[PDB]
Design a protein around this ligand. Structure first.
Ligand SMILES: Nc1nc(N)nc(-c2ccccc2O)n1
Length: 294
């Protein structure tokens, strides 16, 4: 659009490509997400438009929902770096625990906020978590899955990230809950700590089995109703559960306890964002300044 002097493409998401752009007139720098065709659901436009009203320090502000020329663009406030890039940049030394704690605490505040407003993310991953020089971290692209639905393949063909998908989704549950976001965040927490993805599945079944090999194959005792899930198969191998001390070393017991509650199989037992904020792990939380190289 001629309203911008486009700076560059900065990444690609499940629901569309993201660009950095500068308003030729206002000079404002923003993130522009181009949503990908038939007739563009009218239901979704109003739903996504309602997200412009969300205001929280830990949620990337949705400035505008542009529906012109029969195209859909989301205009977001711009942050300079995503968590995936920061984790890669911090891979040699690791992100200091106080910063990991600060980021997790903030992310839980953002999730607690969205969930209380009946907004789910459903596709949380390091790539859509953004950070700034002031130590803040924010979640972007909330409520897109509920509004549009869910693709399967990108026009550019990009290996969809299954690494952060909750088990109930992988087992074919049709009715997601806020618990799926807690699961994704738990996976991200683990990754910040170990500097390695927790469950790096290559396929949907490999993703599920990686979860099973670590947390044990779920059964009716730990997850009532699991054997009746749409894609559950009695033929699934039965793996014994591992110890978290082996999963996220050298995280302390407060952190392991919190992570274990975020990774409960049963969405109904999985800790809520609000309850997580009260966990002892956050007793000494602070807000450190990250070492950001832009
Ligand atoms: N890959 C990526 N990189 C930066 N620096 N920002 C974003 C971004 C994505 C959505 C909303 C706001 C944003 O800054 N996305």
């Amino acid at each position: 659009m001629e309203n911008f002097q486009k700076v560059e493409k900065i990444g690609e998401g499940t629901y569309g490509v993201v660009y950095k752009a500068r308003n030729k007139l206002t000079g404002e720098v923003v993130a522009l997400k181009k949503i990908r065709t038939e007739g563009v659901p009218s239901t979704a436009i109003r739903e996504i438009s309602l997200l412009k009203e969300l205001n929280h320090p830990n949620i990337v502000k949705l400035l505008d929902v542009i529906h012109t020329e029969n195209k859909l663009y989301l205009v977001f406030e711009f942050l300079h770096q995503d968590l995936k890039k920061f984790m890669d940049a911090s891979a040699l030394t690791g992100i200091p625990l106080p910063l990991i704690k600060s980021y997790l605490f903030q992310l839980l505040q953002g999730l607690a906020f969205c969930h209380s407003h009946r907004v789910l993310h459903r596709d949380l991953k390091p790539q859509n978590l953004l950070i700034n020089t002031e130590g803040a971290i924010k979640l972007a692209d909330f409520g897109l899955a509920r509004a549009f639905g869910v693709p399967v393949r990108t026009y550019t063909h990009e290996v969809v990230t299954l690494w952060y998908r909750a088990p109930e989704i992988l087992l074919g549950c049709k009715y997601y809950s806020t618990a799926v976001d807690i699961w994704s965040l738990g996976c991200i927490f683990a990754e910040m700590v170990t500097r390695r993805a927790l469950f790096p599945g290559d396929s949907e079944i490999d993703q599920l089995f990686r979860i099973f090999r670590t947390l044990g194959t779920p059964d009716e005792v730990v997850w009532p109703g699991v054997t009746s899930m749409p894609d559950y198969k009695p033929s699934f191998p039965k793996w014994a559960r591992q110890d978290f001390s082996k999963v996220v070393p050298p995280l302390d017991e407060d952190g392991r306890s919190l992570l274990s509650q975020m990774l409960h199989y049963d969405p109904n037992k999985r800790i809520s964002a609000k309850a997580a904020l009260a966990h002892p792990f956050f007793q000494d939380v602070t807000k450190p300044v990250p070492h950001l190289r832009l």
